[PDB]
RNA sequence: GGGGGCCUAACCCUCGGAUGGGGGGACAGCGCUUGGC
RNA sequence: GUGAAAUGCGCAGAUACCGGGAGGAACGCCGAUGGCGAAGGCAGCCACCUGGUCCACCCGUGACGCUGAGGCGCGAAAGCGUGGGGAGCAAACCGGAUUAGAUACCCGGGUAGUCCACGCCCUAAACGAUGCGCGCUAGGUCUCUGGGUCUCCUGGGGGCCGAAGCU
């Protein structure tokens, strides 16, 4: 088991109601890979640098889990599938580094 | 990698005595289970060649030191070198 | 990957024959609504067709589901994966939970035990069909009805596999085994993955007599014949071309389209 | 197309001939000059006087239209580079900006001999 | 002459979120801004760029804003 | 009258009988006539 | 497009501009006198599997060491085999120009190849032109990396100037 940081971004453009059903299906594959979760958040929408998807704007997420290192892969390719899922990417847990401390 | 436990079901298991982490006995076993993770890695990394290097490394220090135990007594050495299996 | 053999005599030097490594354990077909009788070199006068037929080693035939979509949501074990002497492709005798038993051309990948279903609810797991307009795109897919209702046409030699490019309206982009770009329908079904048995191509028939079990009979040039028989006949001393290139018919046969101008197909294709 | 006032300017510029097309905010092209246009041929065609000249005919040709306001983009490092622009000041447009689009990749396509 | 990092307190130069924070070091191109001007440690500089180029990657930076007035 | 787009019901293909469903579609096929290879 | 040109492309609408789509290959800024590796060599980002290396604690085995003919393994680019892939570039090849000539330097085209899978090839200015290990013999300065309460001490790398000495 270790610790990640999944992001993922989303459309947009889509109602809030869907918004709730890929919400849904970020959590059911989440378990299916036992990705259990801890402090999360989701920063809505904001300002991208670049359009991505045609679309100057983009809705955010954001976690922190414990899961087998194994199947961790295997999970970003089940996020992805989803059409309204623009940006997946986990990430290795890291202690904060800082400078000018 | 290998787990930090799985080093003491080893260590634990192959010490001549409590707080023994250095034996001839210690090293081979713990040279022994690293060597075989590698090996069943290059069985289907067949491509890496660097990491295959550190095998024959790994193969040729515990060569040596089973020189040197089968030396110094060949007690140990019948017995140890049959509990992990060796020598075929 | 392919088996090959030392030349304790010649033309045994070079052939090649596949291995039947994914081939089941099972030599016996599944005799139950299964296999079924064939035959037959030339047309329904009794006039050849087809130059150069017949011969071949003696065949049943093995019964395959094309359609796949008269069993929407019923899943299957995958039994078996079988020999099949009609295609290039092995095919895999799966079990219904239904307690019906069917014949599907095996994809790469499958392998005995895999929980492979049919329908539009269906997962991008291998060896499940969906309409294509469910399938992501970009997905690999293969056995692809041509239009709705009419069964697999598509990318069903071995190793042969159709590729996803995108969507528009009701139809689905498709990039054939071809290379052709078509339109085709979205409620046409196709299996996700690529055919089973990619090794296929690498073969070597090694002697003529090879050819004779796959009934195939001997070819014999143009050149080789007589004025009367073929355009390039007449070889009055091994003789080349009288201009140019033709078939035993008479048209020519080195590049000259032949696919038919005002085809409806026509507006659906993309080169 | 039609009549319009704001617009932007395209300064193409390299080191064998200076290229100006006026479009309007859309983008969609309204006219264009060039080294050859005005006349030169050749080498010449490189030359910032020719890019001047071009500058101003395709500003020019421009005004008639209806032009008056033009955001200035840039693609190039020939002799009319900045002098194309010189030549846009004086043109009788209103010089809205100036900006350096010219395309640079991060590393990608093996360039030719040089 | 404006080192960057004096420009800014306490901040978790890992953090590939903070807009604000990494933005001060992109310049008016989306250029990573050299070690010369971000004044930062060799480690620093590094880990840093690392997590630049991370946040590129969701959007939440330029890969290259085009060079304005001139 | 020409050109572009959509439609369905002729006409064609197909779907565990269908008086219907799906696909193509005023095209294609076929009739008479025109010139050509 | 060049020294200037011409071949070339363009009214069958090119170059220049905007939008949409397909595809291959390489990774700008960071980036350097920088880092890693036994060498060849290695660079966007992400995760997985894995080799080596360094510092501290002074806990463990107790000379178990060094070198190494043969043997085995790796080994840039080009090249070869079967099958993929092919955007850019590009030997050969074609044309333009140059020249006394110009199978070349320059220009317009252009195919293997460059990319992927697997199998061969085994060469090089494979250069530090410096075989490996261990001890010994002033220092000054720049830099990388680690430990210690830290304008300095203590390890391991990457440079420059230079004691003695060698040449
Ligand atoms: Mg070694
Ligand atoms: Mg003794
Ligand atoms: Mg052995
Ligand atoms: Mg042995
Ligand atoms: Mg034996
Ligand atoms: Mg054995
Ligand atoms: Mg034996
Ligand atoms: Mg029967
Ligand atoms: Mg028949
Ligand atoms: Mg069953
Ligand atoms: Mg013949
Ligand atoms: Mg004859
Ligand atoms: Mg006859
Ligand atoms: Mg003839
Ligand atoms: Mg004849
Ligand atoms: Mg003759
Ligand atoms: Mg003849
Ligand atoms: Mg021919
Ligand atoms: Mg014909
Ligand atoms: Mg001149
Ligand atoms: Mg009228
Ligand atoms: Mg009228
Ligand atoms: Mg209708
Ligand atoms: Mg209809
Ligand atoms: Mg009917
Ligand atoms: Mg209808
Ligand atoms: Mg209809
Ligand atoms: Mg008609
Ligand atoms: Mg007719
Ligand atoms: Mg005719
Ligand atoms: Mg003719
Ligand atoms: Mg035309
Ligand atoms: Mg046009
Ligand atoms: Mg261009
Ligand atoms: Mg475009
Ligand atoms: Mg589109
Ligand atoms: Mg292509
Ligand atoms: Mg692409
Ligand atoms: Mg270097
Ligand atoms: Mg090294
Ligand atoms: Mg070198
Ligand atoms: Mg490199
Ligand atoms: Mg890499
Ligand atoms: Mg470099
Ligand atoms: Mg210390
Ligand atoms: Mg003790
Ligand atoms: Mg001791
Ligand atoms: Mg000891
Ligand atoms: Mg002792
Ligand atoms: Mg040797
Ligand atoms: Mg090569
Ligand atoms: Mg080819
Ligand atoms: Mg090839
Ligand atoms: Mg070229
Ligand atoms: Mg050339
Ligand atoms: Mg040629
Ligand atoms: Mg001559
Ligand atoms: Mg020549
Ligand atoms: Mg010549
Ligand atoms: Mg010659
Ligand atoms: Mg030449
Ligand atoms: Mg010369
Ligand atoms: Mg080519
Ligand atoms: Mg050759
Ligand atoms: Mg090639
Ligand atoms: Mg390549
Ligand atoms: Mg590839
Ligand atoms: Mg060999
Ligand atoms: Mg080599
Ligand atoms: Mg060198
Ligand atoms: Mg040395
Ligand atoms: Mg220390
Ligand atoms: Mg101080
Ligand atoms: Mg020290
Ligand atoms: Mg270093
Ligand atoms: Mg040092």
């Known amino acids: 088991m270790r610790r990640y940081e999944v992001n993922i971004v989303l459309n947009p453009n889509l109602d809030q109601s869907q918004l709730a059903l890929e919400k849904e299906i970020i959590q059911r594959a989440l378990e299916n890979y036992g990705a259990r979760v801890e402090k999360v958040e989701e920063l809505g929408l904001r300002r991208l640098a670049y359009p991505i998807a045609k679309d100057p704007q983009g809705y955010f997420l954001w976690y922190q889990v414990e899961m087998p290192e194994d199947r961790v892969n295997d999970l970003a390719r089940e996020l992805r599938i989803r059409d309204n899922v623009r940006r997946v990417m986990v990430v290795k847990s890291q202690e904060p580094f800082l400078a000018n401390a | 990698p290998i787990t930090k436990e799985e080093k003491q079901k080893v260590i634990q298991e192959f010490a001549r005595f409590p707080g023994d982490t250095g034996s001839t006995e210690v090293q081979v076993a713990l040279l022994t289970l690293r060597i075989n993770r590698l090996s069943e890695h290059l069985k289907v990394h067949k491509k890496d060649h660097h990491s295959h290097r550190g095998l024959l490394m790994m193969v040729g220090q515990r060569r040596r030191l089973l020189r040197y135990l089968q030396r110094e007594d060949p007690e140990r050495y019948r017995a140890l070198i049959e509990k992990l299996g060796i020598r075929g | 990957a392919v088996k090959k053999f030392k030349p304790y005599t010649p033309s045994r030097r070079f052939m090649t024959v596949a291995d039947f490594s994914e081939i089941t354990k099972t030599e016996p077909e599944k005799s139950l609504v299964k296999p079924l009788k064939k035959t037959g070199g030339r047309n329904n006068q009794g006039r050849i067709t087809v130059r150069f037929r017949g011969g071949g080693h003696k065949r049943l035939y093995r019964i395959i589901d094309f359609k ?63 309409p294509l307009r469910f399938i992501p795109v970009g997905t690999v897919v293969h056995a692809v009805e041509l239009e709705p209702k009419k069964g697999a046409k598509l990318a069903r030699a071995a190793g042969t596999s159709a590729q996803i490019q995108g969507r528009e309206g009701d139809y689905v982009i498709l990039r054939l ?26 073969i070597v028939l090694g002697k003529a007599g090879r050819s004779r079990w796959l009934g195939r009979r001997p070819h014999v040039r143009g050149a080789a014949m007589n004025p009367v028989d073929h355009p390039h006949g007449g070889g009055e001393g091994r003789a080349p071309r009288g201009r140019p290139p033709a078939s035993p018919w008479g048209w020519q046969t080195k590049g000259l389209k032949t696919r038919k101008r005002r085809k409806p197909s026509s507006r659906f294709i993309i080169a | 197309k039609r009549q319009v006032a704001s617009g932007r300017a395209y300064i193409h510029a390299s080191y064998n001939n200076t290229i100006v097309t ?19 041929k050749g080498s010449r065609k490189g030359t910032p006087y020719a890019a001047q000249l071009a500058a101003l005919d395709a500003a020019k040709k421009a005004m008639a239209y209806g032009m008056q306001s033009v955001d200035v983009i840039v693609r190039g490092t020939g002799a009319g580079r900045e002098q194309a622009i010189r030549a846009l000041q004086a043109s009788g447009l209103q010089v809205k900006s100036i900006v350096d689009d010219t395309p640079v990749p991060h590393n990608g396509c093996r360039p030719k001999k040089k | 002459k404006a080192k960057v990092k004096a420009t800014l307190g306490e901040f978790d130069l890992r953090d590939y979120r903070n807009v604000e924070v990494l933005k001060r070091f992109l310049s008016e191109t989306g250029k990573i801004l050299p070690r010369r001007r971000t004044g930062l440690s060799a480690k620093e500089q590094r880990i840093l760029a690392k997590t630049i180029k991370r946040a590129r990657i969701l959007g939440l930076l330029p890969f290259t804003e085009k060079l304005v007035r001139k």
């Open chain 3, 68 to 130: 796949r979509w008269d069993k929407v949501g019923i899943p299957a074990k995958v039994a078996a994966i079988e020999y099949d002497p009609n295609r290039s492709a092995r095919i895999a005798l799966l079990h219904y939970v239904d307690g019906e038993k069917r014949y599907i051309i095996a994809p790469d990948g499958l392998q005995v035990g895999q929980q492979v279903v049919a329908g539009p609810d269906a997962p991008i797991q291998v060896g499940n069909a969906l």
């Open chain 4, 22 to 40: 006026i479009t309007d905010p859309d983008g969609n092209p309204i006219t264009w000059s060039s080294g050859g246009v005005i006349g030169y």
């Open chain 3, 177 to 202: 085994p071809s290379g052709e770009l078509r339109k085709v329908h979205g409620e046409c079904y196709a299996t996700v993955g690529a055919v089973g048995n990619a090794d296929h191509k690498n």
